[PDB]
Write a protein that binds this ligand. Structure first.
Ligand SMILES: Nc1ncnc2c1ncn2[C@@H]1O[C@H](COP(=O)(O)OP(=O)(O)OP(=O)(O)O)[C@@H](O)[C@H]1O
Ligand SMILES: Nc1ncnc2c1ncn2[C@@H]1O[C@H](COP(=O)(O)OP(=O)(O)OP(=O)(O)O)[C@@H](O)[C@H]1O
Ligand SMILES: [Mg+2]
Ligand SMILES: [Mg+2]
Lengths: 600, 600
């Protein structure tokens, strides 16, 4: 029921769009912005902030401001990428009971999906405000190269935000839909290069015309889910730290407030250098010595920046080679190169991509909104409102199992179209344990473990010829479902999953409840503000009452009202709701009383 | 020749669009933003900034940052509105030799069109970068309620920027084109309410289908060209100044630099109060005293903001009433209410407008981009690329002359469709002086003077019957042209204009050359920066050269190269281009010398 909204859930920024009849439309949030910072904050006085208001206070509240959670979602605490971030992020990353990467704020342990849910809730309310009705269904995006755990965790985030996730869509696939909607963009093969704040994807996509309908088929995809603008910032931040150290003999790294200011300045400097050739990093009072306060002032040329990050850019080119190889195409077969993501605005990035493909990328694709638009289009394909549009996507990673010898044995190859199904007999009745992994490496140890899937034996029985057949389904969301049955009896076999990543049903239900309690807490927190606004109205009117009385007002009555006015003003300067309400009440009584005497 | 671009030249922000085939497209500037701050700045070190770069340094450069020039363009120095701004604007506003309102930066006097030309040059370059070819033609927008001088001055800005202005288009008309392009928006009457950073317009516009073509006709227009976001900011700033006086016993208004942080904080707070119901103005070390540093910390509620600006909002409602009366329509005749302009995002504005019309404004119009999109559409109509679209606009002000007794006598009534022409005999041969004005007031003294248009007599001659006929043409730009001839002989009569506002041909030609000189100077200023980049590249490579040599490098050689490196690094910290170039040459020589010794 209701509209299926399309939500680009980004590492850095999020964006929501709808189908406006036949045309997709990106919606402005309450702040009037077409994108929303993927930032969640908890204030000292216990408030939860999302988007711009959260971003604004990060500099003074670095420990309790959560950002880039998409780089933790669906990951394990002991993951190399996470272990590195543990030392870098200003907030506290911890291990959950099952070993998953979680965060801790003010003693409270939280799962990444709970945090991302807060962003999704804001995108949901954005759509609801615009539409004037409830929204309960959504298409949510994920990087094409997201693995099973990352996908499911993102889907879980949608549920926690109160959204039925009708489809998890791969981000380059969404961008392709947006690009291809334009009549006259058909029968061509495109390369979608998406470099965002956290992840990098490359997809090769064929747009065709079959039976009057436009078809989109992903031929191959590749990338790196932990390669993005955050990493460019980090290179620049480290440089600035080192230069200040050499210059002023002070190491800013143990100073949380300094490092937060530096992070902000570094990203601004990076962004400036996409258009200017030099930028100035200025941070007055960045620290203090026994000698007095110190100020950071350092010029950074584009040349310097490029030397600090060139290898990151080069890291994005290698998957391009694999994607083309997997697609069975050469650059010459690519009709259009499409850039998506804010980090593609870097001249070096554009130049490297153009040089690789031997052609200039298109300029007529919105790098901030194409993904959300495509998500909305996908929604409209689901609701039947978008006609003559079909898509066929793939799974990005080989699905395999660890077999005797510690080897990775592939069951479903990367770039297989989805949904897809593979069935195999694993046992003639004995108990079975299946170690399922995703990746292309030859050794199981070098791939991503999804878990151990255990089946009990089937007991011997006259005329029983047990054949335990295990089926591996990958759905339209790109998510695995393992089931089993005895072909001989047709009886379903229960699978017990051990050592897997992710939230269980009980946790999810609790986190759904917790999100609702947060919303209730938010409405509560608002009470004070509402009361403050009422106080200002009351002050405004009662001051007019004094003025209108002029001299007709007795000294004692005038003294009383003026005392009540000042007392309310003082209370409003404070944070005590009871005191404010009490002073409003007393002012109202004095106003009423004088009114009555005036009438006398 | 080339593409006709559409430029929304706004008080606060500017935006450029083109026809991308059959569809309008807004273009990102070099910074990657879809709109560009209408701000220019001159640094102490002699650099010119435009757009975001100028905006970013405004707070610390009060005197040499120019903004809101659209509020001065085409005005006289002794204008009430200008005289008030003189005391408020941080930059210097002076009287030009002809009494026009100009600005002065570092002793250099400049006309408003020269400043707006710099903004237009960036929008021009923005389009050129995107298209990959020169752009020499444009449609430029102006508020519907702009008078003759403001229109011409805006046209002159276009020329100074190197653009042929193919059309000056009224901003609500442009927004209507944008809205009405979408098939299925025909046969309706709309109200376009445009409240921006500086101007307010209301236009009532009929969209009809005639002979298979969509027609747009402005039925009535009204507004206030000096009512906008700047005035809302001003109300909040004045309130904060007064409160800080009471609270901390200090007057900030005598203080340029405190006022900059406050202006910026006030605008941010105002904007926050469009979504939140409270906002905190926090300005640490805002000023100093004999008691030490002072800090501003004041919470402002939405109720407070509304009480401060409600009369400005009411000021925007009164022209709506006149517009409907002039159009001969009631609110029930209006099918759609369209909001344009960032200042319409204020809830109180939306509520007052909805309540007046008795219906909710549409939500599917982009308040920041519709105007530029419409300008592009107008360009497409001109080139013939946009088919089956026709428009008919009006002049917003009655055109009259001062006649005997100091009375305003109307020749062309407000809301007359343009182009239009009025002709009249003024003399039977005697010399003639004609005082032309725009406005609705009974007394000429209360209207806007356009100048005195003078004609010499025609001498007595046998069989001569001089009939000096004067013609008042208003063109499609809404601009007046006065001409005269003797109907008896068909001979044109020279009109000498006195006491008129605006640039003469010689000034315009000079300013065009100056704009080109600025561009060359800006290209010349860049050299310091460009040399830095080369310096950094040189350092990067030569350092690798040292590393590669390892211990094989003799002490005296190692010492020589290490010294050359540090010397360049030191020079790069500096601001002396010659020194950098010298140290680069010296480093290049030692790099070469080592290279040659290594080969040996
Ligand atoms: N002009 C610019 N030049 C370089 N980088 C930029 C520019 N503008 C934004 N960025 C960077 O782009 C990144 C954000 O891009 P985007 O909003 O596309 O990411 P996202 O969709 O949230 O991330 P992801 O897809 O990786 O989850 C940030 O790292 C930001 O610093
Ligand atoms: N969310 C918001 N709430 C209130 N005001 C806002 C908001 N966002 C922007 N503004 C205000 O809108 C104004 C800028 O609007 P806009 O860019 O439409 O003006 P413009 O087109 O440059 O000006 P004009 O049309 O008057 O020449 C500024 O005064 C700014 O403070
Ligand atoms: Mg993205
Ligand atoms: Mg405007």
């Amino acid at each position: 029921s209701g509209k299926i909204i399309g939500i680009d859930l980004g590492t850095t920024n999020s964006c929501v769009a709808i189908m406006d009849g036949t045309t997709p439309r990106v919606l402005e949030n309450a702040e009037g912005d077409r994108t929303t910072p993927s930032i969640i904050a908890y204030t000292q006085d216990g408030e939860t902030l999302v988007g711009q208001p959260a971003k604004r206070q990060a500099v003074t509240n670095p420990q309790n401001t959560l950002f880039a959670i998409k780089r933790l979602i669906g990951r394990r605490f002991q993951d190399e990428e996470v272990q590195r971030d543990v030392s870098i992020m200003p907030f506290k990353i911890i291990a959950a009971d099952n070993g998953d990467a979680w965060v801790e704020v003010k003693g409270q342990k939280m799962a990444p999906p709970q945090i991302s849910a807060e962003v999704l809730k804001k995108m949901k309310k954005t759509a609801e405000d615009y539409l004037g009705e409830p929204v309960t269904e959504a298409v949510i995006t994920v990087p094409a190269y997201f693995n099973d755990a990352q996908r499911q965790a993102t889907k879980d985030a949608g549920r926690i935000a109160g959204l039925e996730v009708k489809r998890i869509i791969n981000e380059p696939t969404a961008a392709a839909l947006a690009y291809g909607l334009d009549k006259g963009t058909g029968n061509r093969t495109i390369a979608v290069y998406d470099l965002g704040g956290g992840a990098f994807d490359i997809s090769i996509i064929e747009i065709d015309e079959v039976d009057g309908e436009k078809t989109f088929e992903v031929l191959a995809t590749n990338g790196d889910t932990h390669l993005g603008g955050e990493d460019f910032d980090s290179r620049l931040i480290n440089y600035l730290v080192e230069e200040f150290k050499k210059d002023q003999g002070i190491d800013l790294r143990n100073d949380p407030l300094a490092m937060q200011r530096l992070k902000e300045a570094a990203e601004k400097a990076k962004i400036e250098l996409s258009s200017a050739q030099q930028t100035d990093v200025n941070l007055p009072y960045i620290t203090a010595d026994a000698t007095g306060p110190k100020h950071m002032n350092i010029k950074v040329t584009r040349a310097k920046l490029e030397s600090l990050v060139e290898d990151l850019v080069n890291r994005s080119i290698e998957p391009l080679k694999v994607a083309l190889q997997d697609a069975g195409l050469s650059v010459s077969d690519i009709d259009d190169v499409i850039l998506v993501g804010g980090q593609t605005r870097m001249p070096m990035v554009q130049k490297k991509v153009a040089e690789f493909f031997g052609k200039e990328p298109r300029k007529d694709v919105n790098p901030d909104e194409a993904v959300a638009i495509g998500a909305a289009v996908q929604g409209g394909v689901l609701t039947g409102d978008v006609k003559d549009v079909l898509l066929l996507d793939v799974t990005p990673l080989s699905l395999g199992i660890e077999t005797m010898g510690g080897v990775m044995t592939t069951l479903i190859a990367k770039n297989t179209t989805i949904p897809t199904k593979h069935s195999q007999v694993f046992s003639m009745g004995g108990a079975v344990t299946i170690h399922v992994l995703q990746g292309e490496r030859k050794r199981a140890a070098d791939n991503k473990s999804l878990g151990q899937f255990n089946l009990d034996g089937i007991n011997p029985a006259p005329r029983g010829m047990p054949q335990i057949e295990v089926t591996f389904d990958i759905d339209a969301d790109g998510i695995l479902h393992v089931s089993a049955k005895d072909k001989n009896s047709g009886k379903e076999q229960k699978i017990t999953i051990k050592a897997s990543s992710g939230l269980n049903e009980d946790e999810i239900q609790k986190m759904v409840r917790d999100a609702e309690a947060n919303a209730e807490a938010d409405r509560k927190f608002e009470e004070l503000v509402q009361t403050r606004n009422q106080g200002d109205h009351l002050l405004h009117s009662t001051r007019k009452q004094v003025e209108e009385a002029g001299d007709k007002l007795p000294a004692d009555d005038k003294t009383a009202i003026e005392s009540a006015l000042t007392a309310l003003e003082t209370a409003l300067k404070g944070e005590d709701k009871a005191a404010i309400e009490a002073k409003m009440q007393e002012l109202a009584q004095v106003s009423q009383k004088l009114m009555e005497i005036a009438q006398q």
